[model samples]
Target chain A: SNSWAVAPGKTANGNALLLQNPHLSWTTDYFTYYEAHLVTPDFEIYGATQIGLPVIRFAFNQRMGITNTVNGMVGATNYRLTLQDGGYLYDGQVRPFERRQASYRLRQADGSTVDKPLEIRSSVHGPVFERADGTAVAVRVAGLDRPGMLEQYFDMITAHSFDDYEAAMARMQVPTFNIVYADREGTINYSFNGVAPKRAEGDIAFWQGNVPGDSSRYLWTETHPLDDLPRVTNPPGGFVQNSNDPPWTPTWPVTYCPANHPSYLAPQTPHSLRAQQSVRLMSENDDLTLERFMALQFSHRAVMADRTLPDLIPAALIDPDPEVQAAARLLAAWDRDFTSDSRAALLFEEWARLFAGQNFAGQAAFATPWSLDKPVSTPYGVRDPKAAVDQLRTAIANTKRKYGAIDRPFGDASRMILNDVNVPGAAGYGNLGSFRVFTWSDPDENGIRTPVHGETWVAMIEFSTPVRAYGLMSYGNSRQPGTTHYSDQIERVSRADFRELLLRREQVEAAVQERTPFNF
Target chain B: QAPIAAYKPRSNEILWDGYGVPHIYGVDAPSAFYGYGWAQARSHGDNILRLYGEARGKGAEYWGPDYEQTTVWLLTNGVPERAQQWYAQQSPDFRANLDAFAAGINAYAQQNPDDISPEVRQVLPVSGADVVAHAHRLMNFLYVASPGRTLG
Candidate 1:
């Protein structure tokens, strides 16, 4: 999941806006998102969560809202224990693990329950388990003691102002999720938000691996509070975004220096293609309206194509191969958008696949590799123009046979299928670095790919007077059969439109389909 | 604590819109969560129940051996017991809220027994501990969750 919050100065109406898009698979309970609006006398909060979680993850309210991208905080430290006398040495002091045996009724497949004994142990490090190879690994993680994680989020969603929100964050109960906050007061904050262990040494790298459990140096349990974690409150850039990138690249100028903070707090790495596109798209727009913000959320422009096409088209135009030049000309006129009607997208997608099959990681696709110095622009230019042209020639040949026409519409091949309704899918892979994304399933007999992952729940909120909000559950609200929203929203997914995020109770009453009123 | 059968509502209700999004209404917090739990069950009873079962180290007791590893994980972490402690530690108002949320699930299941699959019915009449345990299960698992699991 990746999110970006725009301050009031950046919006056309000078109202803060937020856009949340959680990238996940189309399968599993984890990928599923249940959208709802909970209203009471105290607060009316709206958002979605993977069903069963009481507190909303991507949550919003009248005054402010927050979205999260999975962050790079190394919150858990795994330890490789040298087993000694049924326990491992902690600073050379050997102590037996806290071992216990318990029992439960294990229901057999025969519809009968039998007694089952559970024997487990834990070190101060945490729960210990033996690997298949007899190696014992113990993991120490954060926020287990802070049981108010739900209450913390509950307070956050119920918050009336930035001060309330700050206090909720100060609780530091919820462990990880890089938070991007925006309020009607034009206050915006981005946190590398989490309870991360304050390790004495090592970068995000060394801490990620299993350190020697015998030493006290690697066994620190204290965590950095929310204030100490890296964050930028109301940046000069007017926006803060994270596409699972480290906290440093939340804005254009790079506000947080890695050296200033604890090395284990966040990684020092360049942005992903999607990460680059996030900053590039947000930075380009200064005064964005709700419509413009919505449009930006649905942007299918592939950053990978944006960067590589200039290098490929020029090289292919002068190529000896006629097919390569013909395809190059077609793509040159291509808007580089992944919309349904694009004849260019089919061939380009094929070409990208062909290039990928070349096993060039031994080398690489880009002549100029990605670097923190120029994250967005440096990962441009094809490494070998001859190979690139050859790939395009191959792509055209394969695409023609694959789809019956080289210019076959992208939507014809790529579809968002839910039960019987199959609509043209709007976006392609996040791997392609498109702002909008849909990871695809492989083709069947016909050359049709179904959406497998990416884009579960999307919310674009404008902190206007009435607090204008819109959202899309690309998969709709329910996975259960015989429900109204079962396959009701696939028609809108292709168009990149949204359902009305109704705020007022009266407005909701106007569109009530089924009512389950209760309790006197 | 009020008995699940003896539970009374303080002007609580739920309005599900065109997209099946529930607008849960209540005069107070606990009642609102009561409606929250009902709405959750109306849409996702099986999912939540199974999750609670796993968190309670009782998945193997409810489902078959498929969830043995899951139960083992929870039991290993002492999550079921911690959930009990966490439940007892909660403020009375929030504790009632949790109780009402679970009672709401039970009320829904009782009203519509046919709706819940037989396999999941064993996890019925969930308590505040299950709610707390479910949250703990999700949170701690997420901390230990492999980036390769969700980063894709």
Candidate 2:
């Protein structure tokens, strides 16, 4: 119901688009019934779309089936999301149990004044929305829809005040991947509380304070909505993409956004391997076709990391022991995929994981950090027993010379195991393949066997095109075993598969209007 | 006997999962609140009195200056001291629950000791004056969290 008609990219009119990945909880609750409704009949849809409020947004449905036009934008300014006035916000229904003791002020490069901070006082039309109805509705649906929910949060700030709601939310702890959205009607939306909001004014205690105090600012990430985010309705290139990289560098050379404009919306750590690889792949060619797009999106290779590892590997297969040389060669010749079947792949991946972010020392390191993401000659990615023999000899000799014996397997030596009680069977218990699990309660730190926290959700949306395509969200959309969305997308999602988006009625509607039942 | 705001314990997944240790996860900033609360309520939720090594400045009055290393470093790194002043300055509308949060901590200390530290029990005497004196000290801690840290 909250959608509209827009042009399809095939018509050569470029096309209008809409996209919204309003990050929500990723727990079993969302996976239960919330996720599957991504493609529901009414307003809900998953990933990105076109049927936006205005003209085509970054990616509209019209461009379905098209691919590989431009790469991610490099320097585009991020989308902004400021608190809005009206409804509960206009009223004072939401009241804080305690006053904030800190406040914030904005500083600009130029001496010119920036507008007031998005605090309670700086809000516009500070009355009217405070009626009982407005307050109740706003607080009730605070975390429901994306911007709608964020708006409600602002309303709650006025209602219960920031302290009560913040403490409440913290107790609940927001769940979900970060979100970014834009619509077909040439409007963009953005909001985030994943990390804390920027304090318009504050001292350390004030910002961290959840107490009642005089003259404190109710912090919020957005003072205004995103206006400069990476956006282009129907670019000359006819393509757009985002691979879950930081909103800063959406793609390559597209350079439409700034990498470090202080927006509370972007993830603290921007850039990821898959995102880098997708951007690279997209940039290689232009005038993308559907098949090519799908192929590129689903490519299992880890090109980004692969490019760096080979240079790090030792040149002379000469190790202290002969077997070490063989191990080196095996690593060099192997394919990167770490599937359930490839034992050797698992070993090498484990070796590499052990080495990540840590430089190996004199004799403790492997021939070099094992490289994945590269094409290999064999399915096992070069598991030649002959090579293993050589490495075994080298390792044996080295161990004798150094300590005593080569006592551990790559798995045993590195100690890459981590388990969680929350997940049955200890999630990371004896990891099946190269994919290792690490828990959060106690984490992996500094090459230690602590709870490692990485690789949860990965997303990349190629935004410079119609129906900006994307690649992920780690788990599938269903909690129930036999549901339709259950694991339907798990394989593809984990492997980073990109599909054509249908952001508007004009795009999806075209087929539905004519195709009948199977239009979606 | 006196006017006080509602003191409701925040409902938290992590806290409830602690299997009923109402002291740890129940309080948002455990070290800060618990240390002060215990001192006021029977001295230490348990029967002993223990100092909560301040993250900044001298917590030395109880543990003495030897344990003051980390807090001093924190202070050097810019931890403020005037938290109470800041808390006092905030709008009245925001102070609605301050009294309650304080009360909740006191109540937990009064009821539980087996799971809580013994220091709490030694600190909180049964008398009303003891409760009142401790309450004032607890407010000071809360005030520090509110405005004190803002300066640094």
Candidate 3:
């Protein structure tokens, strides 16, 4: 009755396939959870912790040579992943309530199919969802590919013991999420009754009206059953991407439906600058190349759009202080990209200087740190100049006061400051060479030593008919503080080569054979 | 009124985006204060007055609430007939700020105004005082929620 259902796929190349879609956000409100899949010679391992299901909600073939991470780095060896910790954890081991209805989904080469787990057997397949446990959940449908990947992944999944399932649940790879997929193997999607949109009363205004026009109706609307959302498989565009955009716009623009459609999806918006910038760059560059994609993703300009140097120069020139003006004019002559070798970049940092103090390093953040590789910076960088300038002066003074230096090359000041890990290295902005200048979140420092946002899993891949070729980064898969994968992926993502993700037999076997099993 | 349910108890996300200024979304009045306080805490943490100071009638004991803003609040709260005269006689544009601010409060009122106490709503038709009172009241409703708690 709802417009759609939730499930997973059964293609060999589908479920275990890895792709790093972009859902970059500023607020730290992302769903941070555990998810992993290990494929071994004897069995396949995959699982996750959704709302209720103690067993894995979405994992397959970790032990069978298939490995995955949500927002971490991906490497042939290990994927450096970003994960949210300290969220609510449940006792997933509780037995299912007697009245609970279980559901499961499978994808054939044709499309997606679903079944109740209790009913799937005697047919005896692991049902992905069942009542008695978690109730509200929606499965996204745009991530499917060839059916072989799904089938291989499912085989590893449906045949797991409770202990293995529990281990899988604890090792839940990425945070909470669902996958929808379809390829020559048909369409299939799945959810472990994870995300049930609940209707609660609150005074948050997001629309034109002062209040929700109808309280009960509005509340009920958010709580729609999964069947109500739009679902599609193998549309006109052979390629589909959804880096956390609204589900209706899950993949290609051609198939997008408004959030207001009767089968309307949950409210989704272009809240993230990265997502907005992606739209711009993708729209501008049709035949996306690795270079162009990087250009767009690493862009340093703000969403207001324009080269940053020219915009920031006038503000510094207007600073009642002469030294600030001298700094501004000097910086104006310099193009804003922060290549490690550029002394000018180390000197005047105009835009970053102007927008420094206001919690974030604004426009000047564009030049001194390093320009992002993406071409569209306007949507991602600072938008308001005056505000940026105000913050800039304050930040410069604070940095100078805190570090006891007025201006230094970025690498000299900001650094990763983990205990026993005072890592000192040279890096420019994302677009400047292989350096991904990650913003450290410490209050006392300018650039705190934090995990590189763009590291861990920067990949470039080309798909062949049966498999794909990948060039991966320094961090392979582990987010452990000093793991080889963590260090290695930093360099790999910095480079435009990520051929390591392609499914190769010897390579995958080697990875599985040598991969260390981690518990954190 | 924006039905009772429409009034959410502001999320840290919404507050974080506002950058401590309820006006991050713009508009003045009680609702703006409500949203401002909710979001300010989301980013800055539980400490109260550090974000926005106390109201006018609450007296000079609490500093930081803009004085010009409080003058209007005290006037509107204490001198109702005179306040009505000012509202009636003010220029359209000047009055627009108050009207828009009041409407903002009303808009939120349509949703969560009742989460506000009856005493809090006394400074209606939103003067600067209402903005201050709303700021004060929102703290109560948002944090502590009992009398004398100031919503901390």
Candidate 4:
């Protein structure tokens, strides 16, 4: 879900460094990803591709590397049109919906099949969804007609330098996502890559929500150019990062301007806690070594802790209730680290979750009256001393009941047990600015919570003397049960150990423990 | 008792490492595809066949009404026709690769009759068009229709 790139000048070894860590589901029902090295006469690519996809969706070539995080752009839109005479209203003219019949076979419990049919209709906009009130809605997806996404991706990986990479990116046929790039030439770039519609200016509400379909004014017939997107190349800060946030604050000095872009882009979005942590860490460290870079990439410290604890500690210290004082002491003792062995982590996480739920759980986090200086203060905090004391008491009591104690070790509560090996979890939620995130499933009858999502396929590359790199696929490399690699890699990932990515031919050959020939 | 002669490739090399990742080398793309298909079937023959059946609009016939919507989507989008067009648009070399890949799958089916599911076996000998149709439908549903529906 996030990516970062540091220039060679900012690195201790005068080498460019990059991190490609995205939070994807680690499940078998959905084919996650697989690491592959595809070499042809024309191109040599190395990275992970979605299992079902034929090409590498994210990867690095010999000259440059790129990582992607989904951008919050509107990929498609629907327009509610007025229905008339089995058609829909468009620009004061009623256009007949293009109708098609589809049939399917339905199997019965008794093992018999029956035919099921449907009438699918569409307009120029795209697919049509009919409503019971004699109205219809038409959908128009960005780059739906463009069947060149794979081709564009092919071009992107084959790119060797800045010019080639920019040209490939200009194809803009891949729809929406933010692309962060770094190369061996010491250049770093960030692009809010999208194929968004060129809607009429000043229609913010119409663009954000469904627009009136009756007129041509609401239609967008063309997409924005790659040059028009919010992007920066080789900024003064010597680094670029994106955690799915707006581009204006891509770096410290701010490389983009809100006034230059359309209002529909919603340029005033607040940064996520993860983004804040990334900025703070990157800004603080100028000359980073490969070890330091990897350490920061997997850092377990929470930014929200720095903000919330400042206000909460004093409030707890002043509370007259013994239960409240006890809970506050636990919070005071918390090191703000999400490491598995941290005893106070459970109490802090439960309290934070309960506190957020009590105030503005469902509301947008930015809308809360919380700030870095006063993260858990104001309307969200227990303003009344008695209520604050009561909430803390309940949280402690519930924690004791569920965990048998208020000071349970984080690792004991949050664990990923697979192949009969129990590994402590090191991920936290967005509410706490946890860069190393882990969303866990509910505890079973035995009270053991397992990591279901977050932080899969974490890779870091340092363009050094020989281009050293490390990667860990947290879910392992195989979905087939009983395979050696089914749960092998996860063990290393659970220990925060990454396998060396052998890129050279000799390294790969030497590292091959087993090889079967296919002479058909 | 050896590998079936027909399923075996005439000139190809498949190197499977300790992790089961396939590294394929062939005299040409077509022969390489034959090896790829054989490996895929050896590992996931049933899943691939079922997916093809779903793409071919027979999901409901085996899976009941729960899969009727998938069938409808494929049928409405003319997925079968799209597959034919994709195959037609392919270069002669790529087309040959597809043909070889299909042969590879069919040879596996013929050689291993007991492994395939009964319902999936009913639609055995999958064609290159079936592969294209399945891929196209999956892409549209995942990249186009899914996000469009969520936003709408």
Best by DockQ: 1
Residue-level lDDT of model 1, residues B76-106, one tens digit each, is 7678998899888887877887888888788
Docking class of 2: incorrect
lDDT per residue for candidate 3 within B1-152, as digits (tens), equals 11111112222112110001111121222233233323222222111221122232332222222333332323222222323443454445334433443343344434444344342343333343333233322222111121111101
Using DockQ as the yardstick, the better of models 1 and 4 is: 1
DockQ of each: 0.36, 0.02, 0.01, 0.20
CA lDDT of A302 in candidate 1?
65
* Candidate 1: RMSD to truth: 4.8
Lowest summed lDDT over 10 consecutive residues: which window, candidate 4 chain A? A358-367
Candidate order by lDDT, decreasing, is 1, 4, 3, 2
Against the hidden reference, what TM-scores do the models get? 0.91, 0.36, 0.42, 0.85
lDDT of 4 at B39: 51
Clashing pairs in 1: none
User: On residues A285-374, what C-alpha lDDT tens digit does candidate 1 reach at each position?
Assistant: 878998898888887776668778988999899988787788888889888888888888878877887664421112267788777788
Q: Which stretches in model 3 have alpha-carbon errors above 4 Å?
A: A1-18, A21-222, A230-239, A242-254, A257-270, A286-310, A338-390, A402-407, A414-437, A443-448, A452-461, A469-499, A508-520, B1-152
Q: Residue A2 in model 1: shift from native, Å?
A: 3.0
lDDT of 2 by residue, B35-133 (tens): 223322322222212222232232332234343433332332223332233334323422322333244345555565454554234333332222222
Tens digits of per-residue lDDT, candidate 2, A65-165, equal 11111111111111111223332122234333211232222224452323322122212211111222232111111111121221222222222322333
What candidate 2 gets wrong by more than 4 Å, as runs, is A1-27, A31-147, A150-222, A228-238, A256-260, A263-270, A337-344, A357-520, B1-152
Q: DockQ for the candidate 4 complex?
A: 0.20
lDDT of 2 at A106: 28
- The whole-model lDDT of each prediction reads 0.79, 0.29, 0.31, 0.68
lDDT of 4 by residue, B30-126 (tens): 5565655665665556667777777777787878777776676566555667666776665565567567767777777788787666767877788
